[PDB]
Design a protein around this ligand. Sequence first.
Ligand code: NAD
Ligand code: NAD
Ligand code: NAD
Ligand code: UIV
Ligand code: UIV
Ligand code: ADE
Ligand code: ADE
Ligand code: ADE
Ligand code: K
Ligand code: K
Ligand code: K
Lengths: 461, 461, 461
Amino acid sequence: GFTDYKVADITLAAWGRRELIIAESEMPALMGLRRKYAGQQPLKGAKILGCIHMTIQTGVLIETLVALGAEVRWSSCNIFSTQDQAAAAIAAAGIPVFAWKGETEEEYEWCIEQTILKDGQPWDANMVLDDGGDLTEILHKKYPQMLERIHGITEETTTGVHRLLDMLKNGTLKVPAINVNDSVTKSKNDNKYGCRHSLNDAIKRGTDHLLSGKQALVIGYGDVGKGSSQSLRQEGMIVKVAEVDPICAMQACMDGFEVVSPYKNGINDGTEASIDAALLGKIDLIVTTTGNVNVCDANMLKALKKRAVVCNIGHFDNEIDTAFMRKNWAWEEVKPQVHKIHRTGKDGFDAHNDDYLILLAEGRLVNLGNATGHPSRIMDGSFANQVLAQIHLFEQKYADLPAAEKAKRLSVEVLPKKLDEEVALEMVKGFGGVVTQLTPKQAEYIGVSVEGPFKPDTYRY
Amino acid sequence: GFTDYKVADITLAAWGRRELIIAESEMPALMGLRRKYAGQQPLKGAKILGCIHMTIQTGVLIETLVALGAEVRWSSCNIFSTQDQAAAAIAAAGIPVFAWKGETEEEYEWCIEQTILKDGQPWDANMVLDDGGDLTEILHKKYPQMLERIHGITEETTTGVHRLLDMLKNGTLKVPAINVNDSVTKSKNDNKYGCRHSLNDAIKRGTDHLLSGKQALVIGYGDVGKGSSQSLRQEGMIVKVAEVDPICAMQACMDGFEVVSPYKNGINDGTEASIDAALLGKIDLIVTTTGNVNVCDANMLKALKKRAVVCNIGHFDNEIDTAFMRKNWAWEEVKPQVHKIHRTGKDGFDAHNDDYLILLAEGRLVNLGNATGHPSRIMDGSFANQVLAQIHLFEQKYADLPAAEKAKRLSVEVLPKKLDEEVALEMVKGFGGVVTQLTPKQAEYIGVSVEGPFKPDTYRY
Amino acid sequence: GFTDYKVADITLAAWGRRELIIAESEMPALMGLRRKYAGQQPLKGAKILGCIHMTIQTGVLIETLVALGAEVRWSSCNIFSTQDQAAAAIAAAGIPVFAWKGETEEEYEWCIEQTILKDGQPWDANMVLDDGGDLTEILHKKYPQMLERIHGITEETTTGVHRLLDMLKNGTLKVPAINVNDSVTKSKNDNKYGCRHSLNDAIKRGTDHLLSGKQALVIGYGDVGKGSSQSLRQEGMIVKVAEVDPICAMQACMDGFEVVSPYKNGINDGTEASIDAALLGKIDLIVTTTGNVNVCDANMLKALKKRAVVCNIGHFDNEIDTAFMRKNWAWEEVKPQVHKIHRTGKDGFDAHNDDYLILLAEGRLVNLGNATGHPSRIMDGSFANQVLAQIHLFEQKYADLPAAEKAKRLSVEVLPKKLDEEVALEMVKGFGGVVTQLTPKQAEYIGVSVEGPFKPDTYRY
Ligand SMILES: NC(=O)c1ccc[n+]([C@@H]2O[C@H](COP(=O)([O-])OP(=O)(O)OC[C@H]3O[C@@H](n4cnc5c(N)ncnc54)[C@H](O)[C@@H]3O)[C@@H](O)[C@H]2O)c1
Ligand SMILES: NC(=O)c1ccc[n+]([C@@H]2O[C@H](COP(=O)([O-])OP(=O)(O)OC[C@H]3O[C@@H](n4cnc5c(N)ncnc54)[C@H](O)[C@@H]3O)[C@@H](O)[C@H]2O)c1
Ligand SMILES: NC(=O)c1ccc[n+]([C@@H]2O[C@H](COP(=O)([O-])OP(=O)(O)OC[C@H]3O[C@@H](n4cnc5c(N)ncnc54)[C@H](O)[C@@H]3O)[C@@H](O)[C@H]2O)c1
Ligand SMILES: CN(Cc1cnn(C)c1)C(=O)C1CCCCC1
Ligand SMILES: CN(Cc1cnn(C)c1)C(=O)C1CCCCC1
Ligand SMILES: Nc1ncnc2[nH]cnc12
Ligand SMILES: Nc1ncnc2[nH]cnc12
Ligand SMILES: Nc1ncnc2[nH]cnc12
Ligand SMILES: [K+]
Ligand SMILES: [K+]
Ligand SMILES: [K+]
């Protein structure tokens, strides 16, 4: 008689369980943590509010936390990223989850509130796992009393970590956090290689367009932009890259990309005349990867080649001025998460009009919106870090300190390199790779221990 | 009141129609044939039996043949390759089509017969379009009288051309045929680049497996094997290649792949002792590409690494010994066209057994079975050749020739290089490419006309 | 007391012998023929005039022909392509060779004549091995009497075959020929992969320029152009391709290249107004691969980006209008085969002028001019074909047949596919590859012999 959930179709649970069993074989770091810590139950007593894409991969994470003793209440951190069969499997296992593919904004907020509230009253939560900072923001803004009992936050992604550091500098952060994003086995695995796998995957599922021989513009060349550019280049696209960071621009050049700006001489003054109309007129596909605001703006959208695809793989949809397109242009749904946007007018469209753009996932995270996000074996690294971070913060029991002691432990930290390496070793073994062991004299020669850590904390990999 | 069809769901037509309109903008050579020939109606009076994958791309082909004056009756050439919304769009257009995704073998044969028979009698067909030779075989073997009225066959694929050539060698081919496969804008575009696009696409949709860093074995290195190996290598797989043709094997070496055999010394004597158990026990993914029989045999299946993915992108499912797997091992459906094959035995399976293989599309063509096959811009090339082939054979009027002229005309031929080049030029313009025109002195220097053809018929590209 | 040679420096012979011994281990097809046929001496009595780049690789070719019983007299087919240590090692072995790096045009002609003449009068030659057709032309124009005793010509390269075909068509070809170029183990090995290896090699040796991130324009996308484009793209260049053949252009598009023309809309009208000055002013490197005339013309050279590198990897230097650059612009030698060409005028130059181009090998074959051409393991394929072609034509004894039989054998033909496959098998084995053997049933299924040939003669690979 379990009813504390809300999913699209509970009967998809058996299908979801089949895929969870497969995914478990693809996630050895996470399943190794489950085996190593199951008997010790290091999360016994933890009550975790979780807000992250309700995919099959997140399901393995959820059941790993539960296997270690935790109770959880879960929601997705995006309206399009849930895999309904994963949510169904988690609900059928008796775990409160509120998540389905294609939520409205109102339903998105309701789902988070259903994790926060149990039977109309605040749940006695004491841990937070977030991806992007929406749950974190709601707790600080609307439920500050609940944070008095919460031992910490473990934050998944770059945008969320940015919001956390903003609150820390403004003195508004109420509990300590661990930056899961900046582990090497997260940032340089998930953010880069994950988008390499899943960006062309989403574009093919949404459009079935040939990419070889076509022109792409990738806005940004951080980790997500690096992986995105590779996702397209390996398919044979001619890829151009835009950046505001000269060091990232240098890497793009050395990686074999032409570096261009959508604006003449890189200067974005807000006018149509600043747009490089000749450049945008040749682009078949534009992808935003920045985590910034309005990096594919209304003047760029007006100037893009007819029938160009437009998508975003950064965390929030405001990378693209989709508001401008809702106000001025007529939307034709091809299928879910795929819209033709007719630049001929707002009121109606000719079904055979040739002047349209194709928008994927209404400008929300395209890899999760139009495909299934990152594959299990990549998320294995990110989610082993999440499990380790949850254990660390829960065992430190920040909320039980006196007021004076909380002030001294309020911080945003990363996991130590030794744990990063141990996650990486399990990932390598999952590939069948064999790591060499240093001899004692070789370890002394480079000044490390035989068991690591093998690099100083300044090393960039 | 049109009722002459059978599809999964006629209400998918509007969705199919939206995707057809997108596909037309992706297929400029085919769409260019509509404009150049619409006024002349070169297929007026043609009644075409067509048997080929009922995809969106085949939709554009079908409606091109109809726009040039033809009547058609269509079926798919594979039980899993139909896109149900394409079939719905075609039927809703008043065009007879008998095709749905996931047919049984009996329904497959039934669908082809519904194209052959109209109102219980043979249709007065006079043209054939085939992909694989199944329709051609059924006509020769079961409706030879209909071939008295048929002017020719245009065959799409390598396996179908081989069957035509065997019939010709045996004196058992009743109408002339055009080998559409061996146009360069078909074989060196569809067969190679199409599989490059669509193989990893299908594997991702089926399993969502990370491919980077894993081991693949591609059986075959002809056109499909070349494109398949690239599909996987560009994703970061470590790809090994098997071949019986030493020329193709040389190409794989020079392309940067290790060439291996599943058998010790390359000698396939049919025994378990001949299997290189070490090699097979390291392979995460095996893909057959040969058009041959039993190239992923039972002994290889027994020796594959636990949880390896097995699929076939050749035309017929007998490239993998799936019959052996049906007889001996338990099949667990993950989802449509994805099965776990449990090697623990045939009488049931443990849901948490680790000793299984993952078979895609039940060994049927994986790109069409687990995804959508080749993209529109690639199929543009194949299907422009098909339309040109249909025009040439229909206007030749073989069925109306005297018996002496019939005997001189009974052959299997390819399209002339000029037509191949003309298709290629429209493909290049679709990419925005600009071809240079020879000066008269340059044309004289290399001994070609400024208008081409630019290569001798022996040229291999 | 052997003096019948002329080389740069005989004392380089020991060095040349060391490298020949290494190259022998890299040339298993060639050495396999040596071991297989040395007992039979099938070239006993053959007297071969040979004209092909006097490299280490040609050294192994020459000594294989001698090992099989032939006498030869040798010259290079390019003024810059000889490796002086290879020539010295051949002369030290008592083999007539006339070749050194850096010949004048007069010396080049004199060297070919020294092979034709022994003691001031025509040698009793009876076979010809040629690369590019210069020796073949001199025999037909200046020594036609010698051709009445010559049993055949074995021609290495595409341009040479073109000239042979023109002569056959005109009725001026006096002896049969084997087209060695169009063996798959030659054209699709040497012409493509050889240039992939040696083009970026020669550019680095000549300029030491970083190639990553810069813009290249490759004129042509045949076998040489395909390999040259890959040579640059794999280094990270942004590569654009020009073509007159829409089929080759299609391949360049599908291979991930942007296809452009130096002329607006591809129309070369002889005026500067037709030059796409905006495109050419972005190009850092241009490479001609066509075998055509003036594909990098004067107006192009004027519009190139300052400090661009210009080079040719086709057979003859007229692909670039270097005559224009000699007449109008000041040449500054950087080092042998590397010249700065100052576009500021003809009479001298400022040492610090910024407006110059860099010309490699004075527009002669750049891979052989500025580096060492193709590696031994690739030339293995080409030269194994040469040996088999020499054996076949010599044993046919064309010159001694009745003219009624001569008329039936006066042709330009390629080797049989079976021998093409045997050469490929030995190359694959050189890599450690293992070719799989068809079972009798599999061979039956696809219609071949277990021993091959495995493809019809129309197969393009
Ligand atoms: N979709 C996914 O699966 C996924 C995975 C990881 C992260 N993310 C999200 O993607 C975003 C980027 O993450 P990241 O790790 O790459 O961050 P990052 O800081 O490494 O990279 C962002 C880059 O954008 C550049 N940039 C900023 N403004 C720009 C502008 N106007 N024009 C061009 N370039 C500009 C920055 O210089 C920077 O290099 C974040 O929102 C993150 O949360 C998404
Ligand atoms: N799925 C698709 O979209 C698609 C597209 C085109 C063709 N096809 C089909 O794919 C198959 C192959 O087509 P193709 O054009 O590449 O033919 P191909 O002749 O060009 O190449 C097939 C290759 O398989 C090799 N081979 C044969 N038996 C072998 C064995 N026992 N082990 C290893 N290698 C072996 C042959 O040497 C040959 O090089 C045919 O059935 C064709 O109809 C499928
Ligand atoms: N340097 C080497 O090691 C090496 C090796 C092999 C061959 N070659 C020589 O290289 C040349 C090319 O050989 P190939 O086998 O590639 O011949 P090919 O016929 O395969 O390719 C030449 C290509 O140039 C294209 N072309 C012709 N005129 C053009 C123009 N004005 N603009 C653009 N493209 C144009 C043609 O369409 C053709 O595709 C020949 O001279 C050959 O003898 C050199
Ligand atoms: C047949 N024609 C006219 C033509 C072009 N060249 N020549 C000598 C005649 C076309 O344009 C087709 C070519 C293939 C598909 C699109 C349009
Ligand atoms: C090993 N092979 C090839 C073959 C035949 N069948 N299979 C499955 C493989 C043979 O033909 C031998 C068999 C015994 C002695 C003579 C020749
Ligand atoms: N598959 C996935 N599950 C959860 N979060 C993700 N972020 C990116 N891919 C993801
Ligand atoms: N999309 C497609 N439609 C028809 N035939 C195909 N063969 C391969 N892909 C195809
Ligand atoms: N190394 C080499 N030797 C002889 N001829 C060649 N042609 C291209 N490379 C060569
Ligand atoms: K996934
Ligand atoms: K498709
Ligand atoms: K060399």
